[PDB]
Amino acid sequence: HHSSGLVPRGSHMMDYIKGMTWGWIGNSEDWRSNEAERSMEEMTNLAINWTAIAFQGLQETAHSPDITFAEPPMVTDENVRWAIAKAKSLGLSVILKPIVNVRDGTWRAHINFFDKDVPCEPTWSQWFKSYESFMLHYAKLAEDTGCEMLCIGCAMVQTERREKEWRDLIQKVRQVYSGIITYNCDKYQEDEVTWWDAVDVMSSSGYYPIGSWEHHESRIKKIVESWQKPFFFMEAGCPSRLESGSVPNDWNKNRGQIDMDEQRVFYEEMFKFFHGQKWFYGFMLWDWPAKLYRLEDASENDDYCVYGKPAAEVIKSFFTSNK
Amino acid sequence: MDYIKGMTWGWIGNSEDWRSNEAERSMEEMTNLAINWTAIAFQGLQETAHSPDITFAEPPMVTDENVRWAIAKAKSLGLSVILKPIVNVRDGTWRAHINFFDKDVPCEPTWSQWFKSYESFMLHYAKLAEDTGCEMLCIGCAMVQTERREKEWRDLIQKVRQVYSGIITYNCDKYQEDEVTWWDAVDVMSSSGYYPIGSWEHHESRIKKIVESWQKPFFFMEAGCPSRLESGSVPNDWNKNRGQIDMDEQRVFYEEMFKFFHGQKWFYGFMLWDWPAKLYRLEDASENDDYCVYGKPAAEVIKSFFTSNK
Numbered sequence: 067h068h069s070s071g072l073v074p075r076g077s078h079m080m081d082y083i084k085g086m087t088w089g090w091i092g093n094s095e096d097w098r099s100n101e102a103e104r105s106m107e108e109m110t111n112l113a114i115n116w117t118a119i120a121f122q123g124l125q126e127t128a129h130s131p132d133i134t135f136a137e138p139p140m141v142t143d144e145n146v147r148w149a150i151a152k153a154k155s156l157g158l159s160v161i162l163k164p165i166v167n168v169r170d171g172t173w174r175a176h177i178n179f180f181d182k183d184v185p186c187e188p189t190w191s192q193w194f195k196s197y198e199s200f201m202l203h204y205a206k207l208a209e210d211t212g213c214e215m216l217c218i219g220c221a222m223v224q225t226e227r228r229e230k231e232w233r234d235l236i237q238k239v240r241q242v243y244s245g246i247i248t249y250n251c252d253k254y255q256e257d258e259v260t261w262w263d264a265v266d267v268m269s270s271s272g273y274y275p276i277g278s279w280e281h282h283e284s285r286i287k288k289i290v291e292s293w294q295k296p297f298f299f300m301e302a303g304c305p306s307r308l309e310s311g312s313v314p315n316d317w318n319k320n321r322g323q324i325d326m327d328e329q330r331v332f333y334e335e336m337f338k339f340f341h342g343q344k345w346f347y348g349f350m351l352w353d354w355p356a357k358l359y360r361l362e363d364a365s366e367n368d369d370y371c372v373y374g375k376p377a378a379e380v381i382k383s384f385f386t387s388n389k
Numbered sequence: 390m391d392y393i394k395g396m397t398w399g400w401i402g403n404s405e406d407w408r409s410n411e412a413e414r415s416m417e418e419m420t421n422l423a424i425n426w427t428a429i430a431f432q433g434l435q436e437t438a439h440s441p442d443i444t445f446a447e448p449p450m451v452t453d454e455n456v457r458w459a460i461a462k463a464k465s466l467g468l469s470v471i472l473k474p475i476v477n478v479r480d481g482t483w484r485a486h487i488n489f490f491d492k493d494v495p496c497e498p499t500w501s502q503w504f505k506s507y508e509s510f511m512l513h514y515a516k517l518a519e520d521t522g523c524e525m526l527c528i529g530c531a532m533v534q535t536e537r538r539e540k541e542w543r544d545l546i547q548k549v550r551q552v553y554s555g556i557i558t559y560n561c562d563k564y565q566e567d568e569v570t571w572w573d574a575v576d577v578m579s580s581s582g583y584y585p586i587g588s589w590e591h592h593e594s595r596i597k598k599i600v601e602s603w604q605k606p607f608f609f610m611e612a613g614c615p616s617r618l619e620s621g622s623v624p625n626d627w628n629k630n631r632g633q634i635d636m637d638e639q640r641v642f643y644e645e646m647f648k649f650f651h652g653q654k655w656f657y658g659f660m661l662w663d664w665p666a667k668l669y670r671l672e673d674a675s676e677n678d679d680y681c682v683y684g685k686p687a688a689e690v691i692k693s694f695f696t697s698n699k
């Protein structure tokens with residue numbers, strides 16, 4: 067079958083991940099451009115051996131059951147096959163990461179339905195059927211393209227209690243995708259997912275504030291040892307902005323207030339505490355755009371991207387080191 | 390407890406509307422339904438379903454003077470009063486989705502922050518309800534995705550009891566009568582009776598069993614139907630078939646509801662939905678698509694029920 071501990075069953079293959087996320091938010095026009103090719107090649111200078119190909123699907127509100135995918139302006143199946151094959155042509159292993167977003171701008175962590183089925187209301191059953199169609203479409207693409215890993219969700223906090231529905235979705239994914247399955251829980255939620263045993267690898271969003279990494283290493287170590295599964299960060303990063311290090315997840319904080327040093331300090335601290343531990347399997351960083359800004363414009367860029375910034379040198383020297 | 394023959398007045402709670410001369414004519418006209426109670430309903434506001442701060446008693450919401458006016462006017466007309474402060478969401482999300490993570494997370498709003506804000510809102514109006522002699526206070530309306538927060542609801546009710554000495558109810562949503570674990574903490578159970586045409590006999594049997602399991606009084610804190618095509622199939626859906634008038638659909642809803650819910654000794658009646666502070670002209674009733682029954686055939690079904698033998 068599939069249940070296992072520290073190492074996924076041989077038929078699904080644990081590598082130490084040196085990764086960068088590519089392509090977010092997933093815009094067909096961006097991925098089809100010439101610039102996308104230059105972007106992905108430049109990303110390889112971080113001395114990564116993995117990339118997460120990340121893109122969005124959409125639902126209207128946090129409480130609507132229908133998810134749309136692979137329609138304008140979202141990525142086409144051809145754009146996705148292109149990105150996977152290009153990555154593999156550059157020597158990278160691939161995590162496919164389909165992520166549902168909400169058109170009204172609500173954070174997907176609030177997607178939620180009543181516990182009680184009510185006749186005139188949307189139900190969990192209707193949303194999970196729609197989510198299953200979305201994730202099974204990309205699980206089949208992941209299989210066809212040889213993606214080493216599939217991430218079956220990202221910080222879906224207010225769905226995680228629906229344990230039978232998550233287990234049922236995973237059983238369907240297993241029937242069409244034979245590689246490694248992970249789920250990406252949100253920051254602070256590593257001990258709150260009751261169904262970690264149903265995936266191959268645990269992962270979370272490492273957006274822990276400056277000054278907290280030593281505490282989180284100790285907290286996470288105990289959680290991972292209690293589950294006896296491999297663990298890595300499926301996202302970790304910080305914008306190059308004033309005070310972003312105190313809330314590295316907050317992509318809306320202090321827009322246009324540039325601070326290259328804040329991003330650098332975040333990375334130095336994260337790598338000081340998370341490195342070679344036998345129970346830890348590395349970093350999928352956040353993030354790198356399909357259309358990359360000019361090196362000359364990097365000192366004025368307020369994004370998560372490390373291209374042209376001091377943090378890039380911290381990452382490169384960590385990923386090419388003997389830790 | 391009293392058998393409630395009620396109509397909700399003043400929603401959505403607009404200071405300008407309540408301060409107008411028309412508000413007085415509206416509440417007087419409402420008394421011709423042969424009601425003995427009114428629910429004085431008005432909104433408080435939060436930005437989103439996941440924000441912790443509730444604003445109240447600021448423009449364009451009702452002033453404390455507007456609220457004292459409405460309560461005293463109702464009482465001057467011989468009505469008992471339910472005070473019904475209702476939180477709404479500025480972005481238009483239904484309040485039943487107001488919700489926070491079960492786990493407190495440093496960079497996220499918490500249940501503790503929202504309940505503190507909700508407590509400030511409800512305790513402001515609980516004190517007004519005490520000062521004005523309101524017979525009942527309704528401490529919430531269809532707050533479905535908060536109801537699991539049992540310790541925080543009980544703590545709020547303990548605070549309300551210290552400042553308000555009248556009857557307390559909580560208004561659960563349609564189909565949720567058996568889902569609230571803390572009914573013991575209020576005096577009277579209530580729900581939103583928006584059950585579709587063809588379902589009332591079924592719901593009478595369902596609700597009877599729930600109420601007899603709890604051994605508490607029960608009544609509908611809301612019940613009504615817009616005068617619109619097919620509204621009877623989803624009487625709660627205030628956005629359905631706007632401007633498609635059907636006086637008969639509303640009448641048929643009321644006739645069925647009163648056929649199955651009437652004099653049962655475990656049942657304590659109806660607070661209907663609703664009646665506006667600014668009432669349309671009788672000549673315009675035939676073209677009005679609201680819940681309001683004024684000038685419509687359903688008003689005569691209500692009057693004949695409220696003045697009847699049963």
Ligand SMILES: OC[C@H]1O[C@@H](O[C@H]2[C@H](O)[C@H](O)[C@H](O)O[C@@H]2CO)[C@@H](O)[C@@H](O)[C@@H]1O
Nearest residue numbers: 090091165167220221271301315316317
């Ligand atoms: O959702 C669109 C925004 O995403 C941001 O990154 C988020 C992302 O949703 C992700 O899944 C993760 O958990 O947090 C990331 C950082 O907060 C940014 O890329 C932003 O530019 C997008 O608008």
Ligand SMILES: OC[C@H]1O[C@@H](O[C@H]2[C@H](O)[C@H](O)[C@H](O)O[C@@H]2CO)[C@@H](O)[C@@H](O)[C@@H]1O
Nearest residue numbers: 400401475477530531581611625626627
């Ligand atoms: O919330 C504003 C709308 O309320 C509607 O009535 C609702 C109301 O919110 C109430 O609490 C209840 O549970 O359902 C009622 C009927 O659907 C209408 O009055 C509408 O006009 C308002 O815009």
